[PDB]
Design a binder for this molecule. Structure first.
Ligand SMILES: O=C(O)[C@@](O)(COP(=O)(O)O)[C@H](O)[C@H](O)COP(=O)(O)O
Ligand SMILES: O=C(O)[C@@](O)(COP(=O)(O)O)[C@H](O)[C@H](O)COP(=O)(O)O
Ligand SMILES: O=C(O)[C@@](O)(COP(=O)(O)O)[C@H](O)[C@H](O)COP(=O)(O)O
Ligand SMILES: [Mg+2]
Ligand SMILES: [Mg+2]
Ligand SMILES: [Mg+2]
Lengths: 464, 108, 464, 108, 95, 95, 95, 95
């Protein structure tokens, strides 16, 4: 029978008896309802509006099987020491999402449940992908294990640099700075996230001179060198056109900003990278607009998960100690989530769901953002071996130049890796290893004296 | 101020001062304590382009002590003085090389 | 001379004596610094890190001209009734940005200034584009004036419907519901933002049956009919492929989600639509993640300006009265900014900069989100004549069906337009016109009785 | 419940009951009070595909009263009884028509 | 004999087109019955109109970096005669 | 798109810019070339031309190379021209 | 700059294999575009009629126009508006 | 190591195509490096049969094109599991 009118959201959307299926997408929401609204109604409205939900009863509902396709809330868990704050668990059937599309899974769940009059704040904490849905995606073009085989580099973390200033340098001067860094002993160099194709330096000029700088540096040292060329462009055609020219110059690696350009563009490029055998570095520009606040937005672990499915060989995870925000317990959570095949559920770490990847390759973690020679033993112990450490100002800001600055970082890293392998704690003897290595190398001794006093210590907004 | 001299480098642990026999023994001991398979590789010339080196005998699957590995290095060194020699460590679970370092350079 | 070390951000980035040029990009930031941090340092760090900034002094800065390319803070204004809260004004030179690219301007300004350790919250309130920069962009594919000429519809706001439920219906049952809505008296029908290409209904089947439904409804009524076909796809190739098939079936209009797919994909489609003469409808899914909170994020008026430059003929502006959040003063602010050629600076309205568009076409406003027949005279008075009013649940939730539901909405609009043209206030006599029109039409009399008690009234989180 | 009858519609104001001569006078008065130019158009057949109607004389640029517009409608009606007749309002600043409504339908 | 200064609005010209700005201004004002002679002395392009064009493909600064030639003016030569030589003979004179 | 330098020959200029009473002065044709695209442009030789006509040549030569050109009536320039970081064109002196 | 009175002259000079264009002549009629176009068509058809019949269009040019204006009200108004409008100046390019 | 010792050819197993643990384009690149080293060391022509058997006809020809790009002498295919239509297509390509 058909009854026209206004139905309560709690009636046929909140079911506590329901048990989640193995082929089901699960989401964890942190909800803050308006005063005078029940916990169940707030959870039901999020579950309804995201999938098959409408403010009034419609007759067309009876033609379809509503019970099969509806999203439902199965559990409500209240937040300790907080009034009008609860964790909602919502199940979504597998059949309603498009295959191999991050855009669909994003537009469906976090489409318009945010900005609802009935609730003041909402935050998506963690999402669970089943094995059946993961198999439709390509994933990373190469992954950790394939990348190390192509680069022929084993035993240590990789070293990188960012050219400064961000804007102003000529195409010829840019290549000179690239050459001097790679000559010293760094594996990679990087373009800034904002560098694309400005009036002062055009992209095709930058690509040509950088290629000459690598060619000289590789033949001199006897080691494979690279540079992440920024492919981010106004249109999908211009993006692919810049990538083609990097392939023509025989470049091993290119970079892209996934959030500002969007997931549609990032999926296109990652598929292209697979077909042409090019490694793909991913910058997380504009992330902190979304993931900063503890009450509203989407946590980064969800954005990290979505990138692994879309495609990417490297990802910025952020330094624990440095100029930008980071929390050790939270960071080690999503870093182990991108690198490992199987991750166990851990509430203190921040992981709400047991995530299982079906033989999908891991993504290399990038630690960057205001780090010098003293932070080296702390970074190595936290991030491990399968990571990239990048020094922008730490390399170029050396009193003697780029090449002695690049040697200073390389000596500091290899001295710590050697000490770790011997059987020494880097948390206890971190200062000692750096100090004893600075006796036989003059470049390290100068760099240690300069950035001794500098320490970034501030309160973090996002907490467990 | 000082200008950096031009020098050819050999991947991992090539920036540190040359490894003593005690230091190499400690690096091999690390490989065995974790549970990885040690192996000896040799080549005529060291280049960034080439990624395969000639395998000396077979990977040591049945290694009990680090002295056994050092004995295989000494055998390859006496047989080939004018060749580069490196020690590599294979992992079976992850299916990737954990450690790689050069122990011998062509003598004069 | 070169000096190595750490320089204070306040020294060469905060200049109060500077006066902004006409060929300059201006931004207004609402800054909340950490305890023990001065107002000037917090303002200078945002200005520095967004453009040509680094944590330590580098030698490569002396090769370039730093004074020409640097972004500077010229005015600091404190927020009334607030401790550690201020408005910062930052000027950026024209030459550092890429021509005709929203991606670059977004990645440059709001790249990584958020998530800084030295500040707890940051918000971008308004952005100014100079005339010289606007000329590089294409803008909207058609605009308000050309759209009305192609559709042949003058005098009134346009009417639309969204098919419910969102997910579950077959391709054939979708087209049947599309047909019944257009037969009644609606101008447009619309796909839900989450409908793309699911297992239960594939896109190519939906596209075919909807085309048959329009053809029958156009011939029956004698008016031009249309339907927004959701083109949003996992890749740039798939997106352009779906648009080509809509062009093949002689379809006047298609829709796209700009934020979830990204600006790169949207700019690609907006150029395509210009070259084929297809109208483009823009859904603002995932907006409320960014623009909800008053302390953190990016305000929607910046995103509205960014869409007008990128391309789009329609944009969702949100209802003042409805199920989703909206403020009358704030709404009318950016609504008059998307349509008009010249907008004067108004602080009470929320506009921080005087905006001028160089003969660039206006974007039509779309009002949607839980509206019924009683909200009709309020929406007509606020949004005006050049707007689209869309009824999802309001049309299909009628007790008699879709065809009487559409006729009820059509009568109610044309009664309001007629009463306005005579010289009657719709704020004072809003209830009177609806009630007197329900005497000669049975369809309106049923619809008025059902949704009399329903009203959405809650406190807004975003305030001036 | 009631089934909606099939009827051919004519864009704006077609859903309201047929307009009286008093009601037409008020709608034309709206055009003049805003400052728009009123014009009369006629056509043999009403179709959604066609977007041009034959113009009656010229747009009335110098209209003082709504009576002058109604006089032009009556002259076109007496001349063409079997033609559709509509009244339009041109805006010169925005360069787009503001109002368009049908006053006459072909007599039987 | 007088100089006449004429202003034109930006919106009437096509973006990134020299062909249009030439056809519009110096179209058919020349060859008028009311005036014996006409000459265009100068033109001013606003910043907003300049940004539409690509401009030179490289420019002075980029060119010198590609050629690796700094400090002095560049030296050129034109092969004589203009018309007559073979392709093999032309290349020998170039060498 | 291909990274090739472009040299521009000003053939047939003298048909338009010769007579002081009729046509289009070369400075207008030089401005149009900077907007359309070209890495080198022919400017003409400076040998004689008295003292007055030498100033005109240096007028449009500075107008092709500099970013900002101030208004100067004696030199020949009627308007203050401002290029928005648009690259300069190298002058060819030949004849 | 041509109207209905220049019609008998244009037929005589250019003959048959020619196109005659009226910009301001069609759109400048007091009645509109449609009566303006009919005034131009009627005038041309009458001039062709008199030519084929064997009448001199240089001497009897005004007579054919006035006869055609008698049975066409659209032409009669156009002849009343433009009649004194004639362009007569000295030509620079001559034999 | 097999080609070094003194074998003429090496072969992929019939079931090897493009599994999650090793992708086809990776296998093609590393095997090409092995042939180049062994050929130069022994002084004899060496080869490896690369498995081009694919889910679709487009995917088959795509894998074959890359083998030609790496200058490979020999490729392999399964004719009964893929079918006669797919095999004839590849045989004509190989010619
Ligand atoms: O622009 C910058 O700020 C950086 O180049 C750091 O510069 P320095 O190396 O000179 O400090 C990096 O892009 C950030 O680390 C990105 O942040 P995250 O890794 O958190 O995304
Ligand atoms: O999915 C929905 O909720 C809607 O279809 C409304 O449905 P009803 O008309 O059936 O309520 C619209 O997409 C939202 O209004 C979008 O928000 P905004 O307009 O703010 O972008
Ligand atoms: O712009 C104009 O003036 C015209 O459209 C005529 O308009 P009117 O009929 O309204 O004058 C023509 O383009 C010129 O006469 C062509 O000149 P020419 O014949 O020398 O090529
Ligand atoms: Mg950077
Ligand atoms: Mg919807
Ligand atoms: Mg086999």
């Amino acid at each position: 029978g058909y009854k026209a009118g206004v139905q309560d959201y709690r009636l046929t959307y909140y079911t506590p008896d329901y048990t989640p299926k193995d082929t089901d997408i699960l989401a964890a929401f942190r909800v803050t309802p308006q005063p005078g609204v029940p916990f169940e109604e707030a959870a039901a409205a999020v579950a309804a509006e995201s999938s098959t939900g409408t403010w009034t009863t419609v007759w067309t509902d009876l033609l379809t099987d509503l019970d099969r396709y509806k999203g439902r809330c199965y559990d409500i868990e209240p937040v300790p020491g907080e009034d009008n704050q609860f964790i909602a668990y919502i199940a979504y059937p597998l059949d309603l999402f498009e295959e191999g599309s991050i855009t669909n899974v994003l537009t469906s769940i976090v489409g318009n449940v945010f900005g609802f009059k009935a609730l003041r704040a909402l935050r998506l904490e963690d999402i669970r992908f089943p094995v059946a849905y993961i198999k439709t995606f390509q994933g990373p073009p190469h992954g950790i294990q394939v990348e190390r085989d192509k680069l022929n580099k084993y035993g240590r973390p990789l070293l990188g640099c960012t050219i400064k200033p961000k804007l102003g340098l000529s195409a010829k001067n840019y290549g000179r700075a690239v050459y001097e860094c790679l000559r010293g002993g760094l594996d990679f160099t990087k373009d800034d996230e904002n560098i694309n194709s400005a009036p002062f330096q055009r992209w095709r000029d930058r690509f040509l001179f950088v290629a000459d700088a690598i060619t000289k540096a590789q033949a001199e040292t006897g080691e494979i060198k690279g540079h992440y060329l920024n492919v981010t462009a106004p249109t999908c055609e211009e993006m692919l056109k810049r990538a083609e020219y990097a392939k023509e110059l025989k470049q091993p690696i290119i970079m892209h900003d996934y959030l500002t350009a969007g997931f549609t563009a990032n999926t296109t490029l990652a598929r292209w990278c697979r077909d042409n055998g090019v490694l793909l570095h991913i910058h997380r520009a504009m992330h902190a607009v979304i993931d900063r606040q503890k009450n509203h937005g989407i946590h980064f672990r969800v954005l990290a998960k979505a990138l692994r499915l879309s495609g990417g060989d490297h990802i910025h995870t952020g330094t624990v100690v440095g100029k930008l925000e980071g929390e050790r317990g939270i960071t080690m959570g999503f870093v182990d989530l991108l690198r490992e095949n199987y991750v166990e559920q851990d509430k203190s770490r921040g992981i709400y769901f047991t995530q299982d990847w079906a033989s999908l390759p891991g993504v290399m973690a990038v630690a960057s953002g205001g780090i010098h020679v003293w932070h080296m033993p702390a970074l190595v112990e936290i991030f491990g071996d399968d990571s990239v450490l990048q020094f922008g100002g730490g390399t170029l800001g050396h009193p003697w130049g780029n090449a002695p600055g690049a040697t200073a970082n390389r000596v500091a890293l290899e001295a710590c890796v050697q000490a770790r392998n011997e059987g020494r704690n880097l948390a206890r003897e971190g200062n000692d290893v750096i100090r004893e290595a600075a006796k036989w190398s003059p470049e390290l001794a100068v760099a240690c004296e300069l950035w001794k006093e500098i320490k970034f210590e501030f309160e973090a907004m996002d907490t467990v | 101020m000082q200008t950096l001299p031009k020098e050819r480098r050999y991947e991992t642990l090539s920036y540190l001062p040359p490894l003593t026999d005690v230091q190499i023994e400690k690096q091999v001991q690390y490989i065995l304590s974790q549970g990885y398979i040690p192996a000896v590789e040799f080549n005529e010339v060291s280049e960034p382009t080439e990624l395969y080196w000639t395998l000396w005998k077979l990977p040591l699957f049945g290694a009990k002590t680090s002295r056994e590995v050092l004995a295989e290095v000494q055998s390859c060194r006496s047989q080939y003085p004018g060749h580069y020699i490196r020690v590599v460590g294979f992992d079976n679970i992850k299916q990737c090389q954990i450690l790689s370092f050069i122990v011998h350079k062509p003598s004069r």
